[PDB]
Every structure is written in C-alpha cells, then in structure tokens.
C-alpha cells in the first residue's frame, strides 16, 4: 500500500487529480452561477 | 572494388559508345562538333515547331520553330565556348578535344553544325 500511495504521489497522477479538482470546481461554479461576467 | 554489371560491361553497348563521335579519340574536334551539332539541331527543331506559341498558324509555324531552334543552338554554342574557357586554363594518348584550342574549335564546329541541322530540318518539312 505504501508503494501504491507513493505511485499516486508522482507528478502525473498528482497533476491529473489536481487539475480534475480545479476543473470540477470551476465547472460547478459556472453551473450554479451561469454566465458570470462582472463582480 | 567497383560494381560491374552487364549493362556497363556488355560489348555491344561498348562498341555503340565507341562508335559515337565524342568517343572517337583521333579525329579533328571541329569535325566532331559539326557532327554533334547537326545531330542535335535536327532533333531540336521539332519541339519548337510542333509546340510553340505559333504552332496553329500556317506557313509560319515552321519558320518560328526553326528560328527558336537556331537561337537555342546559338545559346548552346556560347555555353560550350565559356565552358572551354573556364575548364582548360593550365597544363592511351591524350585527346586533343580536352584543351583550350580543341574545345574552342569544337564549340565553333558545334555552332556551324547546329545551324546547318536546323536549316536542314526546316527544308525537310517543305
């Protein structure tokens, strides 16, 4: 399990998870707050 | 060392190449030029006559084609002269064609033979 977690801690896996989280957050924000142009 | 094949080692092609004027090795260069020029001008007159811009107009297609072939022969003669001037500048038996005087005489013979071949090809179509 330690080796598997270390593999999950590698740069491509971490980048994939982080970008999926960031993209999901932005998509959900644009979904609940459609068409945001100004503050 | 080198690669030998029946194409480059057949006696028939060797005899055919030796019979050509360029590989005579012993005749005057002006005669070689006259022969080569005639053989070239005769074939050169064809494309300009049958494919030039005046190929459809009658009584002038052959005139324009022959004049164009004559101009091409003149350009080729000038090319031969400058080649001889820039190739032989210093220094079996040695062929006299590969020399300044030999190549100059060869170019002059080529010019005379080419113009005669063009003129002969023009009258051959009449």
């Amino acid at each position: 399990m330690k080796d598997f977690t270390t593999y999950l801690s590698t740069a491509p896996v971490i980048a994939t998870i982080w970008f999926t989280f960031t993209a999901g957050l932005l998509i959900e924000i644009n979904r609940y707050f459609p068409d945001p142009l100004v503050f | 060392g080198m690669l030998e094949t029946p194409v480059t080692s057949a006696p028939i092609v060797a005899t055919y190449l030796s019979n050509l004027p360029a590989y005579r090795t012993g005749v005057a260069p002006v005669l070689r030029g006259v022969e080569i020029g005639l053989a070239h001008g005769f074939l050169l007159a064809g494309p300009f006559i049958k494919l030039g811009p005046l190929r459809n107009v009658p009584e002038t297609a052959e005139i324009a084609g022959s004049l164009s072939a004559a101009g091409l022969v003149l350009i080729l003669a000038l090319c031969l002269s400058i080649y001889g001037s820039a190739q032989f500048q210093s220094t079996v038996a040695r062929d006299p064609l590969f020399s300044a005087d030999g190549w100059s005489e060869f170019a002059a013979g080529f010019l005379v033979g080419g113009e005669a071949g063009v003129a002969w090809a023009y009258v051959c179509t009449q």
């Binding site: 080796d3 270390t6 593999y7 | -």
Partner: protein, 741 residues
C-alpha cells in the same frame, strides 16, 4: 523442431514497488532526475524494449503483454462506442428514416453555453452529428434495438478485462519462452486458418442467419419492432424458409454438393442495392464464405509437428537466381530474431492495406445508407488514408532501426540485402532523378497552365478544350471492367462498382454512386500523387540504406539510429541520422496524403455526389473539377476559398465547434514553426536568464531546467505540424460536408 507450449512460471512478481521508482526499466534513468531532460527521456524510452535489455526473450514477453494491453484499450473504445449508440444516440429513430435523420451519438452537457453543439439531427433528438458510420454498420449487422448495443458494450468491457488479465498473466504468471515466439510456421498456420478463416466463417454464419433476413425485412418496408428477433430466426426453419426457400432443405445441399440450391442467399449480383445504396448482403455473405474456405486452405501450408507442410527457411533458400548471388539466405534468421524487421514489413503492408480499404470502401459501399451519407464517406476515406500513410512512414522508421541495431554483416555476405546496400548509391541516384522528372512534369504543367491562363492564352493550357492529356490506360481499364459481366464474368449479374460505367444509383433523391470520368485534370493530379509518393519513398529509402554508413560519415552505425548530428564539421552534418529521414518523410507523407484527400473531396463533390432532379443530376459544386483543377489558382479559389465558407460562417450554429477547431488547428501548425526553425542553443541561454530571475527570488527548482534536445525539438515540431494541418483539413472537410452534404 518440435512445436510445443514453452512457458516459464512466475518470472516477475506482481508488486507496486517499481511503480514508485520511475525510470527503473533503463539503467541510465534509474539513477534519478538531475535535469528536466530526464523526464522527457523517461517517456522517450518507455517502449524501447530492445534498449532496456539485450535478452530477446524478455523483449518478446514485454511485446506480447503490451499487445494485450493495446487490445484491452481497443475493446474499451469499442464498448464505449456501443454504449454511446445505446444510451446517447438516435439509432432507433434513424432506423425508421435513415434518409432524413442525421446519425448522432454524442450529447454535451448544458454548461458555459456549449449546449448549442447539440444540433437538431432529427428524430426528436439533439446531439453532435457523427461521421464514424457506426449506424450503417449496426444496421448491416441486423441490430434494431438499443438493448443489443448495450449488451455488446457490456461484452466489450468483459473482453477488455480478459485482455488485461491475459497480459498480466502472461507477463507475471505464465510467460512464454523465446522458442515459443519463434514458431513462425505454426503462428502463420493459425493466423491464416484459425483467426482469418474462422472469423470469416463465423461472420458468414451471422450474415446468413441474422444480417440477411433482418435487412431483407428492413428493405421490404417492415418496421424494426415487427421484425423477428435473431434468435427467433435461428430457432425455427419456417421463417427462414419463407424468406429463403433453400433453407427448407437444411444443410443437406451443402453435404450433397448441391451448392447451387443456396443461390437465394449466396449470389453474384454485383452493383448496389437500389433500396439502400449499399452492396448486396447476399454477396457479402457469399464473399465471407469463399474467404473463409480460401484462408482455411491457406492455413495448412507450413510444417509444424508432422511431415506434411512447408519450411519457410527451405523455400527462401531454394529461390536463387544468377543475378542476385546467394538470394534469401539469412532472411529466415533475420525475421525470426529481429522484431523491428517484422514491424517494418507488417507496418508497410498494413498501411498499404488501410489505403486499399479506403479506396474499396468509397467505390463499393458495403453498408446500407452509407453512400448517400457523404459526410461518413468522406470522413472514412480520409481517416483510413491517413492511418495508412502514418503506418508506411513507421515501416520505413523500423526498417532503419533494424539496419542500425539488428543488422549483422556476418550473416549477409552476398545476400539480397548485402547487394542492395552495395549499390545503394545507384538506387538513390536513379530515384532522385525520377523524382526530379516527375516533379517537373507534374508541377510544371500546373505552373504552365497558371501562366497561360493569366497571360490571356487559354488555348495554350493543358486542359480538355486546349492541349489535352487523356488517361487512355485508365479509361480502357474502366471500359474493360464495365464490359466484364458480359464476356469475362458470365456469372456476375453486374459490375463490381458503378465507377466503371453504366447507370447511376440514387437513394432518397441523392446520388449514391455514379460513373467517374477521368480527363486531363485527373491525369495531372495522378502524376502529382505519383511524384509525391516517389519523394516520400526516396527519403525513407535513403534513410534506410544510408543508416549505417555513407560517403559523409563512414561510422554512422556507431552513432546510433536517433542522434542529432555529427557536428558542424565536413561543411555541416545536420540531420544525417535515419530518425531525421523519418522526420522529413512525415512531412512529405502529409503533403502527399493532403493532396490525395483534396482530390478525393473535389472529385466526389463535383462529379459524383449531388441531388437528383427531373431529367438531370445536379452536383454539389456543379461539375467544376474538369475546368478548374488544372491550375493552382483553381484549387485555391474554387476548392479552398469557395468550400471554406461553411467552416468560417459556422459560428452561432451546431457546427461552430468545427470553426473553433479550424482556428485552433491553424495555431498549433504555426506553433510548429517555432520548433522547426529554431535551435536549442538560443532557448538554453534564454532559460539561463529565466533561471537567474528564479535564483534571485529563491524559486529555482532542484531539477535543472534544460531546453529540449535537438531531436526532441524536431519531434515536437513535426508532431505539431501534422496535428495542426490534419486537424485543419478535418474541421474544413467535416463542416463543409455536413452543411452541404
């Protein structure tokens, strides 16, 4: 001598320990990164199995397991296509109206205004119009409901799981030995008989029992819900006997050599189905039956464990003439010990086959309602053509890899390969001359036509009205094929295709297939294709023959297959490696295939595709190919400028995405020019200044930033060039063919 199953038990232990140690496969990469170059190297040598170790057995085991992983990926992709057709498509509605409803199998979520991409494809459905042709393929197989597609998707997922399990089992539990992989005779016997023959026989059985009755009822006008299920057709002989009377006799005429009785479902109709526009399914079923018998016969040629059969080594050694020295001696050992040589041969034939598939598929449409779907036809032809060209370039690359790594002069003293390498100078010089001759006599005609047209002299151009260059050989071949069913094909009811000649076949008011005439423009574009293919062959062949040595660098083989250069010496030795020859061959392949697909698109939209009216056929472009394809200006104005209108004004509609990609593809391609025209020295110095700014703020990474290598720069540039150009043509073709076709 004995063909058996040789397998080693548990050679590699299944663990995650190596998953946390990147670059473990390479001895140089296992140390760890110090510079950013290492990262790129980690991906550039991941599949270079022969570079990790010199053991042929380990390389073969890795290749075999990698093949299983690839098959699992393919099964996942196919399962996804079936799932999308079963849950996010309009296949059921398209079945009741395939001539008006546009096929669609992709729906987008209503986010950031992208819902506009869900166009009105018909049948009360909103989505993206697909061009893969899965609807026509499913209709040809007899699929009438989404449940069948869903079941096929689940089966595909199960097959993918089995493929991945097979790869793991064959790499960690039961790994085959080297002698098992070297059984080329047994492998060829099985692949010919078992795989190909049994697959053709099984597909013939499905076509005879499912595709033929379901499609017969579909063409007869029966609703898909009223058509009996395939198992109902396979369970009783009454329904099949009513649809095909020969089924009343069972399998008895097959064993009594009364095959002529089965003429109701095994025919030689030829031509196309006037109802659907595709090939007759009885002809395809009979075709698969004949293919199965032929391949099953071919699968009993090689010697495996008994006296009967052939030894490929003996056959190769027996072929020797007086003009080739020894002959095929050593070829059996080369193909049984080098994976790169086999990959080169397989990639070359595979790419050629893909191109042949594209041609045969547009000319003889085998699926129902496929010919009238101009978008699917154009997309299928273009896609298969590109795959074929890429595989051909890869074949040249692997031939060069074999010549650099696996070539051995001690086994090639006077063979065919030895003599080819001995006269490589003559081969390359003659190919260079023929390339120059073809280039002049192909491009100069267009330049001459452009000049004559601009000078106000259309009578001096190379056109049909003026001086013409008619393809008499192609026209004679076309006439021969058109007249074949009356003299040289007494049992054929019609010709193989309608492109040779005859009447046109139209489905739903659209021309499915009509004769294709060849003129001066066709002659010129064919010579253009020949010239481009010859130049691509010249670059790839030069990179393969001169991969080990040349008159410039006598020890090129010592420098490897993929190296940037040998310094600025000898005037400059930039791009001397075989890798660089493949790099240039990719550009030439792109040029060749792009002109090929452009010619296909213009010819089909000008003389084949179009609508059918009262006493006349109106084409998409109005038949302007014969008059405008003889000049470069005609290709730029009538084909590129005129047809790009659909992709540039696609904004605000469902095809707007194509327009966006049309712009994005112009970016990536231009992006490629930054990597192809520059050198890494400039970028390294620029990185030095950026590293200085980072060191000033204590944000300099431990892994030293290095510019991309010379080879990596060339690879990135060619990759972006190919992606941008192909994506540009893809967006333009799809938008135009969907809007006007």
């Amino acid at each position: 001598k004995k063909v058996k199953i040789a397998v080693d038990r548990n050679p590699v232990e299944t663990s995650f320990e190596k998953w946390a140690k990147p670059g473990h496969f390479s001895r140089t990469l296992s140390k760890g990164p110090n510079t950013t170059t290492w990262i790129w190297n980690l991906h550039a040598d991941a599949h270079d199995f022969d570079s990790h170790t010199s053991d042929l057995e380990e390389i073969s085991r890795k290749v075999f397991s990698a093949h299983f992983g690839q098959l699992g990926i393919i099964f996942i992709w196919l399962s996804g296509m079936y799932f999308h057709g079963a849950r996010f498509s309009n296949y059921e509605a398209w079945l009741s109206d395939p001539t008006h409803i546009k096929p669609s199998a992709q729906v987008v979520w209503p986010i950031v205004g992208q819902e506009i991409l869900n166009g009105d494809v018909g049948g009360g459905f909103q989505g993206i119009q697909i061009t893969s042709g899965f609807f026509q393929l499913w209709r040809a197989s007899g699929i009438t409901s989404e449940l069948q597609l869903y079941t096929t998707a689940i089966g595909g997922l199960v097959m993918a799981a089995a493929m991945f399990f097979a790869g793991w089992f064959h790499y960690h539990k039961a790994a085959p030995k080297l002698e098992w992989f070297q059984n080329v005779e047994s492998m060829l016997n099985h692949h010919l008989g078992g795989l190909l023959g049994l697959g053709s026989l099984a597909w013939a059985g499905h076509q005879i029992h499912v595709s033929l009755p379901v499609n017969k009822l579909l063409d007869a006008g029966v609703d898909p819900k009223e058509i009996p299920l395939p198992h109902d057709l396979l369970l009783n002989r009454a329904i099949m006997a009513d649809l095909y009377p020969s089924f009343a006799k069972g399998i008895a005429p097959f064993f009594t050599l009364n095959w002529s009785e089965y003429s109701d479902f095994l025919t030689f109709k030829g031509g196309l189905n006037p109802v659907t526009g595709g090939l007759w399914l009885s002809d395809t079923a009979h075709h698969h039956v004949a293919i199965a018998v032929l391949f099953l016969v071919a699968g009993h040629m090689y010697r495996t464990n008994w006296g009967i059969g052939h030894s490929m080594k003996e056959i190769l050694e027996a072929h020797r003439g007086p003009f080739t020295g020894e002959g095929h001696v050593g070829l059996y050992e080369i193909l049984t010990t080098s994976w790169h040589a086999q990959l080169a041969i397989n990639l070359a034939l595979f790419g050629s086959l893909s191109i042949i598939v594209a041609h045969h598929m547009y000319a003889m449409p085998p699926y129902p309602y496929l010919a009238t779907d101009y978008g699917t036809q154009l997309s299928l032809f273009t896609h298969h053509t590109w795959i074929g060209g890429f595989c051909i370039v890869g074949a040249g690359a692997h031939a060069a890899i074999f010549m650099v790594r696996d070539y051995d002069p001690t086994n090639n003293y006077n063979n065919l390969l030895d003599r080819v390498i001995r006269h490589r100078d003559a081969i390359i010089s003659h190919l260079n001359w023929v390339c120059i001759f073809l280039g002049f006599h192909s491009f100069g005609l267009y330049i001459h036509n452009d000049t004559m047209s601009a000078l106000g002299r259309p009578q001096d151009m190379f056109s049909d009205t003026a001086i013409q260059l008619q393809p008499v050989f192609a026209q004679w071949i076309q006439n021969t094929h058109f007249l074949a069913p009356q003299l040289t094909a007494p049992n054929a009811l019609a010709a193989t295709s309608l492109t040779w000649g005859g009447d046109l076949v139209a489905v739903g008011g659209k021309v499915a297939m009509m004769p294709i005439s060849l003129g001066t423009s066709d002659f010129m574009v064919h010579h253009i294709h020949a010239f481009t293919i010859h130049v691509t062959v010249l670059i790839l062949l030069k990179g393969v023959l001169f991969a080990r040595s040349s008159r410039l660098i006598p020890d090129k083989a010592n420098l490897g297959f993929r190296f940037p250069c040998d310094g600025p010496g000898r005037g400059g030795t930039c791009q001397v490696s075989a890798w660089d020859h493949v790099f240039l061959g990719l550009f030439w392949m792109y040029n060749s295939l792009s002109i090929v697909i452009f010619h296909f698109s213009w010819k089909m939209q000008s003389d084949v595709w179009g609508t059918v009216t009262a006493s006349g056929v109106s084409h998409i472009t109005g038949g302007n190919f014969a008059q405008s394809a003889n000049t470069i200006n005609g290709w730029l104005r009538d084909f590129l400028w005129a047809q790009s209108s659909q992709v540039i004004q696609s904004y605000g509609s469902a095809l707007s995405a194509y327009g966006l990609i049309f712009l994005g593809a112009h970016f990536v391609w231009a992006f490629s020019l930054m990597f192809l025209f520059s050198g890494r020295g400039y970028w390294q110095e620029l990185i030095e200044s950026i590293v200085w700014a980072h060191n000033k703020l204590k944000v300099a990474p431990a892994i030293q930033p290095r510019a991309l290598s010379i080879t990596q720069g060339r690879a990135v540039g060619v990759a972006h060039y190919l992606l941008g150009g192909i994506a540009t043509t893809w967006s333009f073709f799809l938008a135009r063919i969907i809007s006007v076709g």
